[PDB]
Amino acid sequence: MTFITKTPPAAVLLKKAAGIESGSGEPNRNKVATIKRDKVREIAELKMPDLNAASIEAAMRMIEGTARSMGIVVED
């Protein structure tokens, strides 16, 4: 996936894949999808080989905080 196939940014990829299309569209309190680590897990795996992540748990760190930018909650 290194040929004109660059993945999207954590948030986008998160709000996109984990944040579905946009069940909200005009939210307010934020958080429109509560996915388990299984989502930020794969998501990080895809955007892992290309992102500046520093490690699995490291990707979830910046990946999770980024999710809070839209509404991709993450529960253990």
PDB file of N, CA and C in Angstrom, residues 11-74:
ATOM      1  N   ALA A  11      -7.767  10.663  12.614  1.00  0.00           N
ATOM      2  CA  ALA A  11      -9.165  11.160  12.761  1.00  0.00           C
ATOM      3  C   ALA A  11      -9.999  10.743  11.548  1.00  0.00           C
ATOM      4  N   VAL A  12      -9.745  11.328  10.408  1.00  0.00           N
ATOM      5  CA  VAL A  12     -10.531  10.969   9.192  1.00  0.00           C
ATOM      6  C   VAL A  12     -10.718   9.452   9.126  1.00  0.00           C
ATOM      7  N   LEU A  13      -9.647   8.713   9.036  1.00  0.00           N
ATOM      8  CA  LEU A  13      -9.771   7.230   8.967  1.00  0.00           C
ATOM      9  C   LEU A  13     -10.637   6.738  10.123  1.00  0.00           C
ATOM     10  N   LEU A  14     -10.450   7.300  11.278  1.00  0.00           N
ATOM     11  CA  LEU A  14     -11.256   6.879  12.457  1.00  0.00           C
ATOM     12  C   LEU A  14     -12.706   7.326  12.263  1.00  0.00           C
ATOM     13  N   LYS A  15     -12.937   8.608  12.186  1.00  0.00           N
ATOM     14  CA  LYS A  15     -14.329   9.098  11.990  1.00  0.00           C
ATOM     15  C   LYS A  15     -14.907   8.449  10.732  1.00  0.00           C
ATOM     16  N   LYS A  16     -14.072   8.140   9.784  1.00  0.00           N
ATOM     17  CA  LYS A  16     -14.568   7.498   8.539  1.00  0.00           C
ATOM     18  C   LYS A  16     -14.945   6.050   8.829  1.00  0.00           C
ATOM     19  N   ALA A  17     -13.963   5.218   8.983  1.00  0.00           N
ATOM     20  CA  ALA A  17     -14.227   3.777   9.260  1.00  0.00           C
ATOM     21  C   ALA A  17     -14.954   3.618  10.600  1.00  0.00           C
ATOM     22  N   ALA A  18     -14.360   4.070  11.671  1.00  0.00           N
ATOM     23  CA  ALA A  18     -15.013   3.927  13.005  1.00  0.00           C
ATOM     24  C   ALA A  18     -16.148   4.943  13.150  1.00  0.00           C
ATOM     25  N   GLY A  19     -15.996   6.110  12.589  1.00  0.00           N
ATOM     26  CA  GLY A  19     -17.073   7.135  12.706  1.00  0.00           C
ATOM     27  C   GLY A  19     -18.100   6.937  11.589  1.00  0.00           C
ATOM     28  N   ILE A  20     -18.130   5.773  10.996  1.00  0.00           N
ATOM     29  CA  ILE A  20     -19.108   5.512   9.903  1.00  0.00           C
ATOM     30  C   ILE A  20     -19.159   6.710   8.952  1.00  0.00           C
ATOM     31  N   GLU A  21     -20.110   6.726   8.060  1.00  0.00           N
ATOM     32  CA  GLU A  21     -20.210   7.859   7.095  1.00  0.00           C
ATOM     33  C   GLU A  21     -20.399   9.175   7.854  1.00  0.00           C
ATOM     34  N   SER A  22     -21.352   9.229   8.745  1.00  0.00           N
ATOM     35  CA  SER A  22     -21.586  10.487   9.512  1.00  0.00           C
ATOM     36  C   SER A  22     -22.966  10.435  10.164  1.00  0.00           C
ATOM     37  N   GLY A  23     -23.241   9.391  10.889  1.00  0.00           N
ATOM     38  CA  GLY A  23     -24.569   9.266  11.555  1.00  0.00           C
ATOM     39  C   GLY A  23     -24.966  10.609  12.170  1.00  0.00           C
ATOM     40  N   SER A  24     -24.006  11.421  12.522  1.00  0.00           N
ATOM     41  CA  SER A  24     -24.336  12.741  13.126  1.00  0.00           C
ATOM     42  C   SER A  24     -24.442  13.798  12.032  1.00  0.00           C
ATOM     43  N   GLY A  25     -23.330  14.280  11.554  1.00  0.00           N
ATOM     44  CA  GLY A  25     -23.371  15.331  10.502  1.00  0.00           C
ATOM     45  C   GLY A  25     -23.434  16.698  11.185  1.00  0.00           C
ATOM     46  N   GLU A  26     -24.201  16.798  12.237  1.00  0.00           N
ATOM     47  CA  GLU A  26     -24.307  18.085  12.974  1.00  0.00           C
ATOM     48  C   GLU A  26     -24.417  17.776  14.469  1.00  0.00           C
ATOM     49  N   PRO A  27     -23.400  17.132  14.987  1.00  0.00           N
ATOM     50  CA  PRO A  27     -23.347  16.741  16.406  1.00  0.00           C
ATOM     51  C   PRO A  27     -23.023  17.949  17.288  1.00  0.00           C
ATOM     52  N   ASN A  28     -22.594  17.708  18.496  1.00  0.00           N
ATOM     53  CA  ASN A  28     -22.261  18.838  19.409  1.00  0.00           C
ATOM     54  C   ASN A  28     -21.407  18.318  20.567  1.00  0.00           C
ATOM     55  N   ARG A  29     -21.911  17.370  21.308  1.00  0.00           N
ATOM     56  CA  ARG A  29     -21.126  16.820  22.450  1.00  0.00           C
ATOM     57  C   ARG A  29     -19.979  15.965  21.910  1.00  0.00           C
ATOM     58  N   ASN A  30     -20.004  15.655  20.643  1.00  0.00           N
ATOM     59  CA  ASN A  30     -18.915  14.825  20.054  1.00  0.00           C
ATOM     60  C   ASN A  30     -19.114  13.362  20.455  1.00  0.00           C
ATOM     61  N   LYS A  31     -18.399  12.467  19.830  1.00  0.00           N
ATOM     62  CA  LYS A  31     -18.543  11.023  20.171  1.00  0.00           C
ATOM     63  C   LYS A  31     -19.825  10.473  19.544  1.00  0.00           C
ATOM     64  N   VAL A  32     -19.726   9.890  18.380  1.00  0.00           N
ATOM     65  CA  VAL A  32     -20.942   9.335  17.720  1.00  0.00           C
ATOM     66  C   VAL A  32     -20.748   7.839  17.463  1.00  0.00           C
ATOM     67  N   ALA A  33     -19.681   7.275  17.957  1.00  0.00           N
ATOM     68  CA  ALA A  33     -19.443   5.821  17.737  1.00  0.00           C
ATOM     69  C   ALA A  33     -18.451   5.300  18.777  1.00  0.00           C
ATOM     70  N   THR A  34     -18.846   4.326  19.550  1.00  0.00           N
ATOM     71  CA  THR A  34     -17.924   3.770  20.579  1.00  0.00           C
ATOM     72  C   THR A  34     -17.374   2.429  20.092  1.00  0.00           C
ATOM     73  N   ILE A  35     -16.202   2.434  19.522  1.00  0.00           N
ATOM     74  CA  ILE A  35     -15.610   1.161  19.021  1.00  0.00           C
ATOM     75  C   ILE A  35     -14.585   0.645  20.029  1.00  0.00           C
ATOM     76  N   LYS A  36     -14.342  -0.633  20.043  1.00  0.00           N
ATOM     77  CA  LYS A  36     -13.340  -1.179  20.996  1.00  0.00           C
ATOM     78  C   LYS A  36     -11.948  -1.029  20.382  1.00  0.00           C
ATOM     79  N   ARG A  37     -10.928  -1.456  21.072  1.00  0.00           N
ATOM     80  CA  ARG A  37      -9.556  -1.328  20.511  1.00  0.00           C
ATOM     81  C   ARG A  37      -9.481  -2.078  19.182  1.00  0.00           C
ATOM     82  N   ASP A  38     -10.426  -2.938  18.934  1.00  0.00           N
ATOM     83  CA  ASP A  38     -10.425  -3.714  17.659  1.00  0.00           C
ATOM     84  C   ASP A  38     -10.470  -2.759  16.463  1.00  0.00           C
ATOM     85  N   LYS A  39     -11.094  -1.622  16.614  1.00  0.00           N
ATOM     86  CA  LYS A  39     -11.177  -0.662  15.478  1.00  0.00           C
ATOM     87  C   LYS A  39      -9.884   0.140  15.382  1.00  0.00           C
ATOM     88  N   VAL A  40      -9.519   0.817  16.434  1.00  0.00           N
ATOM     89  CA  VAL A  40      -8.263   1.605  16.391  1.00  0.00           C
ATOM     90  C   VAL A  40      -7.105   0.625  16.262  1.00  0.00           C
ATOM     91  N   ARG A  41      -7.367  -0.632  16.503  1.00  0.00           N
ATOM     92  CA  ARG A  41      -6.293  -1.652  16.367  1.00  0.00           C
ATOM     93  C   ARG A  41      -6.011  -1.861  14.881  1.00  0.00           C
ATOM     94  N   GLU A  42      -7.006  -2.274  14.142  1.00  0.00           N
ATOM     95  CA  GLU A  42      -6.816  -2.482  12.681  1.00  0.00           C
ATOM     96  C   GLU A  42      -6.476  -1.139  12.043  1.00  0.00           C
ATOM     97  N   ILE A  43      -7.312  -0.164  12.263  1.00  0.00           N
ATOM     98  CA  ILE A  43      -7.067   1.186  11.696  1.00  0.00           C
ATOM     99  C   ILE A  43      -5.588   1.542  11.858  1.00  0.00           C
ATOM    100  N   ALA A  44      -5.068   1.433  13.050  1.00  0.00           N
ATOM    101  CA  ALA A  44      -3.633   1.761  13.263  1.00  0.00           C
ATOM    102  C   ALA A  44      -2.778   0.821  12.413  1.00  0.00           C
ATOM    103  N   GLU A  45      -3.188  -0.412  12.284  1.00  0.00           N
ATOM    104  CA  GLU A  45      -2.404  -1.376  11.464  1.00  0.00           C
ATOM    105  C   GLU A  45      -2.334  -0.880  10.022  1.00  0.00           C
ATOM    106  N   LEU A  46      -3.441  -0.454   9.489  1.00  0.00           N
ATOM    107  CA  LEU A  46      -3.452   0.047   8.085  1.00  0.00           C
ATOM    108  C   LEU A  46      -2.611   1.322   7.994  1.00  0.00           C
ATOM    109  N   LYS A  47      -2.944   2.315   8.769  1.00  0.00           N
ATOM    110  CA  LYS A  47      -2.173   3.588   8.734  1.00  0.00           C
ATOM    111  C   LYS A  47      -0.857   3.430   9.508  1.00  0.00           C
ATOM    112  N   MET A  48      -0.551   2.244   9.962  1.00  0.00           N
ATOM    113  CA  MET A  48       0.713   2.047  10.735  1.00  0.00           C
ATOM    114  C   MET A  48       1.926   2.168   9.806  1.00  0.00           C
ATOM    115  N   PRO A  49       1.954   1.351   8.783  1.00  0.00           N
ATOM    116  CA  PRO A  49       3.053   1.357   7.802  1.00  0.00           C
ATOM    117  C   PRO A  49       2.950   2.594   6.908  1.00  0.00           C
ATOM    118  N   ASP A  50       3.145   3.750   7.479  1.00  0.00           N
ATOM    119  CA  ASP A  50       3.059   5.011   6.692  1.00  0.00           C
ATOM    120  C   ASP A  50       2.855   6.182   7.656  1.00  0.00           C
ATOM    121  N   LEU A  51       2.316   5.913   8.815  1.00  0.00           N
ATOM    122  CA  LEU A  51       2.087   6.999   9.808  1.00  0.00           C
ATOM    123  C   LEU A  51       3.361   7.218  10.627  1.00  0.00           C
ATOM    124  N   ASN A  52       3.448   8.316  11.327  1.00  0.00           N
ATOM    125  CA  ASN A  52       4.663   8.582  12.146  1.00  0.00           C
ATOM    126  C   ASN A  52       4.507   7.923  13.518  1.00  0.00           C
ATOM    127  N   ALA A  53       3.553   7.043  13.659  1.00  0.00           N
ATOM    128  CA  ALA A  53       3.350   6.366  14.970  1.00  0.00           C
ATOM    129  C   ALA A  53       4.704   5.943  15.541  1.00  0.00           C
ATOM    130  N   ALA A  54       4.764   5.678  16.817  1.00  0.00           N
ATOM    131  CA  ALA A  54       6.055   5.260  17.432  1.00  0.00           C
ATOM    132  C   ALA A  54       5.955   3.803  17.891  1.00  0.00           C
ATOM    133  N   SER A  55       4.804   3.203  17.754  1.00  0.00           N
ATOM    134  CA  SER A  55       4.645   1.786  18.182  1.00  0.00           C
ATOM    135  C   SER A  55       3.156   1.456  18.296  1.00  0.00           C
ATOM    136  N   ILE A  56       2.819   0.196  18.339  1.00  0.00           N
ATOM    137  CA  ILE A  56       1.384  -0.189  18.449  1.00  0.00           C
ATOM    138  C   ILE A  56       0.697   0.701  19.487  1.00  0.00           C
ATOM    139  N   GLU A  57       0.962   0.476  20.745  1.00  0.00           N
ATOM    140  CA  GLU A  57       0.325   1.311  21.801  1.00  0.00           C
ATOM    141  C   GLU A  57       0.559   2.791  21.490  1.00  0.00           C
ATOM    142  N   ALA A  58       1.651   3.105  20.847  1.00  0.00           N
ATOM    143  CA  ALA A  58       1.935   4.530  20.516  1.00  0.00           C
ATOM    144  C   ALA A  58       0.913   5.029  19.493  1.00  0.00           C
ATOM    145  N   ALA A  59       0.623   4.238  18.496  1.00  0.00           N
ATOM    146  CA  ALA A  59      -0.366   4.670  17.469  1.00  0.00           C
ATOM    147  C   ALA A  59      -1.712   4.929  18.142  1.00  0.00           C
ATOM    148  N   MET A  60      -2.133   4.028  18.978  1.00  0.00           N
ATOM    149  CA  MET A  60      -3.435   4.203  19.680  1.00  0.00           C
ATOM    150  C   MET A  60      -3.393   5.490  20.504  1.00  0.00           C
ATOM    151  N   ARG A  61      -2.251   5.826  21.039  1.00  0.00           N
ATOM    152  CA  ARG A  61      -2.149   7.075  21.844  1.00  0.00           C
ATOM    153  C   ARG A  61      -2.543   8.265  20.968  1.00  0.00           C
ATOM    154  N   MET A  62      -1.793   8.521  19.931  1.00  0.00           N
ATOM    155  CA  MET A  62      -2.129   9.661  19.033  1.00  0.00           C
ATOM    156  C   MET A  62      -3.403   9.327  18.254  1.00  0.00           C
ATOM    157  N   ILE A  63      -3.619   8.072  17.967  1.00  0.00           N
ATOM    158  CA  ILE A  63      -4.840   7.677  17.211  1.00  0.00           C
ATOM    159  C   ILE A  63      -6.078   7.936  18.076  1.00  0.00           C
ATOM    160  N   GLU A  64      -6.043   7.528  19.316  1.00  0.00           N
ATOM    161  CA  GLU A  64      -7.216   7.751  20.207  1.00  0.00           C
ATOM    162  C   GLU A  64      -7.456   9.255  20.369  1.00  0.00           C
ATOM    163  N   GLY A  65      -6.516   9.956  20.942  1.00  0.00           N
ATOM    164  CA  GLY A  65      -6.689  11.425  21.128  1.00  0.00           C
ATOM    165  C   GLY A  65      -7.264  12.036  19.849  1.00  0.00           C
ATOM    166  N   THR A  66      -6.762  11.637  18.713  1.00  0.00           N
ATOM    167  CA  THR A  66      -7.282  12.192  17.432  1.00  0.00           C
ATOM    168  C   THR A  66      -8.768  11.856  17.298  1.00  0.00           C
ATOM    169  N   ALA A  67      -9.147  10.658  17.652  1.00  0.00           N
ATOM    170  CA  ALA A  67     -10.581  10.267  17.549  1.00  0.00           C
ATOM    171  C   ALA A  67     -11.439  11.270  18.319  1.00  0.00           C
ATOM    172  N   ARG A  68     -10.966  11.724  19.446  1.00  0.00           N
ATOM    173  CA  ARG A  68     -11.755  12.702  20.248  1.00  0.00           C
ATOM    174  C   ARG A  68     -11.986  13.977  19.432  1.00  0.00           C
ATOM    175  N   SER A  69     -11.300  14.130  18.332  1.00  0.00           N
ATOM    176  CA  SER A  69     -11.489  15.354  17.505  1.00  0.00           C
ATOM    177  C   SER A  69     -12.830  15.262  16.774  1.00  0.00           C
ATOM    178  N   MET A  70     -13.344  14.073  16.613  1.00  0.00           N
ATOM    179  CA  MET A  70     -14.651  13.910  15.919  1.00  0.00           C
ATOM    180  C   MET A  70     -15.638  13.228  16.868  1.00  0.00           C
ATOM    181  N   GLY A  71     -15.519  11.939  17.033  1.00  0.00           N
ATOM    182  CA  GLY A  71     -16.446  11.217  17.950  1.00  0.00           C
ATOM    183  C   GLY A  71     -16.151   9.715  17.913  1.00  0.00           C
ATOM    184  N   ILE A  72     -14.924   9.345  17.665  1.00  0.00           N
ATOM    185  CA  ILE A  72     -14.577   7.897  17.620  1.00  0.00           C
ATOM    186  C   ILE A  72     -14.128   7.439  19.010  1.00  0.00           C
ATOM    187  N   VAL A  73     -15.051   7.244  19.910  1.00  0.00           N
ATOM    188  CA  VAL A  73     -14.671   6.804  21.278  1.00  0.00           C
ATOM    189  C   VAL A  73     -13.990   5.438  21.205  1.00  0.00           C
ATOM    190  N   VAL A  74     -13.294   5.066  22.241  1.00  0.00           N
ATOM    191  CA  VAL A  74     -12.599   3.749  22.242  1.00  0.00           C
ATOM    192  C   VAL A  74     -12.635   3.154  23.650  1.00  0.00           C
TER     193      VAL A  74
END
